[PDB]
Design a protein around this ligand. Structure first.
Ligand SMILES: O=c1[nH]cnc2c([C@@H]3N[C@H](CO)[C@@H](O)[C@H]3O)c[nH]c12
Ligand SMILES: O=c1[nH]cnc2c([C@@H]3N[C@H](CO)[C@@H](O)[C@H]3O)c[nH]c12
Ligand SMILES: O=c1[nH]cnc2c([C@@H]3N[C@H](CO)[C@@H](O)[C@H]3O)c[nH]c12
Ligand SMILES: O=c1[nH]cnc2c([C@@H]3N[C@H](CO)[C@@H](O)[C@H]3O)c[nH]c12
Ligand SMILES: O=c1[nH]cnc2c([C@@H]3N[C@H](CO)[C@@H](O)[C@H]3O)c[nH]c12
Ligand SMILES: O=c1[nH]cnc2c([C@@H]3N[C@H](CO)[C@@H](O)[C@H]3O)c[nH]c12
Lengths: 233, 234, 233, 234, 233, 234
């Protein structure tokens, strides 16, 4: 009995899920786990079950964009997911400090989408679970990988025009660290459906992927998923 | 030197483009053509040059959702596309009149997204080009396929909640025909970058509570229109 | 039994109606038809029945402004009108291309009013019926009159101040052709009440009437009304 | 050299102006005066110089609706008017207390228009000048005409629909007295251009569900106030 | 039986109430009346009953800020207050004309708060009662004290940042006289609960207290309260 | 040279500040410390330097409400504060789970104010610093005090009306724990001025329909956290 977009079953959904933008990235992640079980591939949603450090968790892709990743997150949350960690890339809003290849672990986001607003009034915060943020940070410490922490702007516009000015400059003076396209949506949906969420991002651009740094980030994401998967096993 | 997301080059972009959501649909479309050439497949964006009735145009996937599809449309418009037609599925907002399997060709859309709003004020209409619309309707007549016309609601929310009421009921009473997730964004981006746009949709569901020959028909109409439109660019 | 503002009866309303801003313009239009029947004149609303090319249709005035023309359109739509075509003047938002005296046939509009927003959420498009737009364009071809096509900004402000900046510059970079004060309102009301609407405008100003060009525009409007009136006779 | 819409010249504008919606009302008002002079009639704008109690002031029509009347008010304010009083009709939002034929003199209005918002932020109040208000009320006392005071809702929507609920019910509970279509716009334009404004209204209807002597009385009060106010401009 | 924040009883509330920002100011006001009766002091809300010119009225403090003064005004209005006059300080938005120490009597305000908007749609005017404004002005005439009249901007921001621009410049070109932080809130709450309100302010700053001028302002406020208290005695 | 409202000087501001609403609460807190020094009392702002566990930090009152408390937070942040913890009371929005007397330590807030919006766009989150949050939670563990975590609604409206429905019901369904009037403003101001913030609240009421030892416990936790945090500033 299958989920409309993900095309996996309720009983295939693990408590912990690592989510990812590029479907290609699922393939490159499962290959560094102890083993894996391919589950489904429909549209941009590729589902693979990972086995790492004695634990098991899904890794699922959602494509680019809040509306498309919302479908993913809703299907996960309405069907037994308890923890969802986003691993992806972003641009830097503090180019003096946060540089290409740097890793950012985020605790909150700017809701520059539409879905979240159709779900709850705009005054509501897009904010992550602390345990998840704490686990991610602690893993980065163990693995001896320096990270930044901060707020991400989650904006549905990648390409600005010359008519309405972009708000990236504002949000950067407001001390937002980075910009991507999915994190706020995950956070709001998670809060609404009692799922614990978090975000780890690698800087790939300076709108204002370094091979070994990407490998570190993935180690952190996977470690954190395994650490949190323990509490549910 | 390649487009950041689509991973094709400016020269590979034909004047007319057919756009679809599901990357799987690109492969089902290309075999209905006379011949084709695979160009690229990056993330949710699969690119293929189609050859139909002596004409040559791309077919490109954009995934689900306004933000993800805006990246596709922008890369296309900034690099030479002149006509972009969306072909996809949708839900009925008129379940007494418009039923699972029916085809709707839309002239305008409700902007229930965000990208379009980060680009111009919300008071600005999401409209399609009337030639594209007219071409689509005329193909539907030549191929003897009955077809609805109307307005689509393009909403970023597929799965509603119990706190903020959905606006579908509202837009239904306002005579919006049909609901999906991409058309408004296409239209506004097309208008701002001087690209003619249009959309054709097959009803796959009824959110109030795919037919193979009808899907085949819709693809036929879409491909027919693309060819007719490619004709006027030598 | 009379309509509250128009002061005509249900049975006096024809399927096709040409609407116009200046009440004076009704008088100048009826005089170039084959014959006419004056119906009423209340406030700014002058109603005259026209007979042209074997067809009959109302021609009605509504004054300047969205709130006042809404009353007109609502009384028409709630009482049997099936097609309403707006004929009027506008300013140009592309002064290099669209010049004083030029004719523009419009398919959609910017909803810079209030009525439409009190009727339906702002995300809803103000857009015309294609058959109407097609008929208008085809008439312009027959009569050998070159026209432009495009989006009109319908704005309730004619006179800007120096505090809030006008959006005309924005909407012009957005590729809007022209600016007037009624078209979006007609379009939204029409869509809401299953009436087919359209707009033909003559450029009279460059905010950013050429005697023979006005005569052409009126020929087009009247031809189009007669062509569409046929389908209902 | 004439005003674009009103078709009168700057010199023809008197310090005090009486404004009305119906162009037909201008003609009914001028004959109640001592004498008058027709000035112009263009579109919905009819202009007449009135002479009442040794005083001289214009009476001008503006049609229905905020956008159409804003053009009138702006042309007047930009060219020398100092006081503008609106006299017109309205509906009751307090049908137990305020009944068909009653007269209301309003100090402030709800801005349910658009023009005012394209001119300043919505947080800005639509208020009248208190002298004008006071003069109107004092005339009502001298002429022994009972009168209500309160806030008017100025709404661009006369004919509501079944999709977006009207806000009249709301504003009624908020103690707004009365409803019409022009006052808010007058007030805001007056405030921005340093012109003193006021309004007096006769109730012609009850949108929840014209009395000749009451209308005569209201016009008397309006003309009385205009004369008293024209007095202080030599 | 006591009010939740003010900690006074229904029967202690007089028909007329003078309200004030600084709790310290209550102490300095009661001392220039004929006599007084201290009632309560809870949080920032100090309540004292004043006896002046044969009349009696409360004088109550509410602190700085719309949210905090709303609590005060609601407790007063829901418990028998009929007239509430605000006496306080403000900055000047017309620095050429309205100078430090000048007195302004206000009839309306810009609703740059949140409470009023949670109570009623933003299109609703924040406007005072005329009798109150008239009384205040007439007292200023008797006492031979020159005053200004105008609209006050009531804004919840005292300290602007460099990201979103302040609207004070706009509201000043719009001909607003002064800026403070409570008046619009009083006016809206008053209108909603059939209480007559008014405002008298002394200019203390030029964001864009003169000892004898403050004394004048207080004389005016007190006179006006006594004059209005008569109608209810 | 003194701060305009707080009436203390830049040098008197310690890196860590404890903030409370009720000026009366400052006096009840200082006596629970090892020693203290009164600094100032102006309007609703009472300032006192506290000494607890060898550490030194201010305690300052800010009255009720976002606008009044923003003045306090801004004066503190502009003049050297590094950590600001809010300790106060609140209502339950989860009355089956969170009961009168329970303590909630909040990580984030709903921005139902205005100040925060005049400072940055509403899409920006009101979040606390996670160290502050973590410190507070750890103190609660050391002192063996059970404690809730969650999101607070910070609303400028204490007394709702019958015209515009309150949004508490909504935010409750959205899993907001608790409701008060200051936290969102603190958080946003902290984020914009690079100051770490947090909040701890005791439930005093149930707006759907103070326990002394629980209040004592909450103050203990707050003071404990302040000391632990002051430690890292020599
Ligand atoms: O500089 C950027 N701006 C906006 N999005 C992204 C991204 C992420 N990558 C995808 C689009 O490039 C999308 O998933 C977004 O979240 C990386 N860098 C940037
Ligand atoms: O009933 C519907 N609601 C919203 N979207 C869709 C669609 C289309 N399919 C995809 C998601 O189901 C998306 O691209 C959307 O445009 C088909 N039916 C519906
Ligand atoms: O340049 C213009 N700006 C705004 N409206 C108009 C108009 C039209 N004429 C009337 C006001 O001048 C009104 O009906 C509007 O629709 C002509 N030119 C312009
Ligand atoms: O009940 C009413 N609702 C809205 N407007 C009006 C009016 C006035 N009459 C005109 C339209 O009926 C218009 O100028 C408006 O201001 C009288 N009664 C009502
Ligand atoms: O220049 C000013 N701007 C904003 N508020 C005030 C005030 C008033 N004083 C208090 C804050 O300084 C507050 O009650 C506000 O209403 C005096 N001057 C100004
Ligand atoms: O149930 C409540 N709603 C709103 N505020 C509060 C408070 C706090 N107490 C003060 C007002 O009662 C204010 O500072 C607010 O933050 C306790 N309980 C509630």
């Amino acid at each position: 009995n299958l989920l409309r977009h993900l095309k996996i079953s309720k009983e295939q959904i693990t408590p912990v899920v690592l989510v990812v933008g590029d479907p290609g990235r699922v393939d490159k992640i499962k290959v560094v786990c102890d083993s894996y079980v391919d589950l489904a591939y429909n549209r941009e949603y590729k589902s693979v079950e990972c086995h790492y450090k004695g634990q098991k968790f899904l890794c699922v892709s959602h494509g680019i964009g809040s509306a498309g990743c919302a479908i993913c997150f809703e299907e996960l949350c309405q069907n037994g997911a308890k923890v969802i960690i986003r691993a992806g890339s972003c641009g830097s809003l503090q180019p003096d400090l946060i540089k290409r290849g740097d890793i950012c672990i985020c605790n909150a986001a700017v809701r520059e989408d539409r879905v979240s607003h159709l779900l709850i009034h705009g005054d509501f915060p897009a904010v992550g679970d602390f345990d998840v943020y704490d686990t991610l940070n602690k893993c980065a410490q163990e693995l001896n990988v320096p990270v930044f922490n901060g707020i991400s702007v989650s904006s549905d516009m990648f390409y600005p025009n010359k008519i309405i000015p972009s708000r990236l400059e504002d949000y950067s003076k407001a001390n937002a660290a980075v910009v991507e396209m999915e994190l706020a949506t995950l956070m709001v949906i998670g809060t609404l459906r009692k799922v614990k969420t978090g975000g780890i991002l690698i800087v790939d651009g300076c709108p204002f992927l370094v091979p070994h740094q990407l490998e570190n980030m993935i180690k952190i994401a996977l470690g954190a998923c395994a650490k949190l998967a323990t509490k549910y096993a």
